[model samples]
Target: MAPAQPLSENPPNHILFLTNLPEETNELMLSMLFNQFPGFKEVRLVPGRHDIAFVEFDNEVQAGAARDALQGFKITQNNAMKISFAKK
Candidate 1:
């Protein structure tokens, strides 16, 4: 029989996220979303000229949980999001 994966391995510390959300998207909303999980140190949302953005998480574990919980989740009932681990 194969060994079960450990719970610690389930979560990662860093995540790379992309969204087509408007620049007006506030930090409060983002904080609320990430605050659902533990160890969520910080969130950095970098704005671009276009209506696109990159979201970064401080801890991989929390990021992993966020990815599982929020991937494909819609924002404002119109914008869908993509979440994944950032490349080293």
Candidate 2:
């Protein structure tokens, strides 16, 4: 099931956690999408988990905004990408 709510209702820091992704997901694709948001830094994929990823921003505000805008964004037909803040 999709989690419409992020990990916290409070403001997120500079890092974001992404899930509900396709197994075929790669850095370049995430990089391209996140790059559209201001202050985007980079995409980090887990070596053993292709279904999830992390993205960084310059600061909290930018990261929070990006999450709000892209939360539940669809990457695959049924993926419905999920976004949340990563813990420091």
Candidate 3:
């Protein structure tokens, strides 16, 4: 939980794996959240799973920016988002 860091030197990746999403959050909501990011590709939210999701982008720079911008994002009143480079 340090302040969001830039992707300065870290190699970039194209997919994002997220955890701790609000139980009420839906695919639409998730998609809307990331819509502003450049090169946003797709978003998948498992029906029965509330805390896990996958979001994709056309390239790593956008993915990295999404990671930096979305981490610690408060999706639910009590839960903050946790984002990482997906292990594709």
**Best-performing candidate as measured by lDDT:** 3
Error of 2 at 18 (Å): 3.8
Please write out the lDDT profile of model 1 over residues 1-88, one tens digit for every residue: 6678553553454765565554466555666677786746665553442233344556666676777776666654766654445564
- The sequence of per-residue lDDT tens digits that candidate 3 reaches over residues 1-88 is 7768763554467788768786677777778766778767978875777567788887877777777777667865676777667654
Where is model 1 more than 4 Å wrong at Cα? 1-13, 46-58, 75-79
Root-mean-square deviation of Cα positions for candidate 2 versus the true structure, in angstroms? 6.0
Q: Which is better, 1 or 2, measured by TM-score?
A: 2
lDDT of 2 by residue, 1-88 (tens): 7787665554557888868776677677677776777778967864566568788888777777667766676765776877667664
Candidate with the larger lDDT of 1 and 3:
3
Cα-based lDDT for every prediction: 0.58, 0.72, 0.73
Q: What is the clash count for each candidate, in the order shown?
A: 6, 0, 0
Model 3 TM-score, 2 decimals: 0.67
TM-score preference between candidates 1 and 3, better one: 3
Question: How good is model 1 by TM-score?
Answer: 0.54
Which stretches of candidate 3 lie above 4 Å from their native place?
A: 1-10, 74-79
Give all candidate RMSDs, comma-separated: 5.4, 6.0, 5.5
Q: Model 2, residue 72: displacement in angstroms?
A: 0.9
C-alpha root-mean-square deviation, candidate 1: 5.4
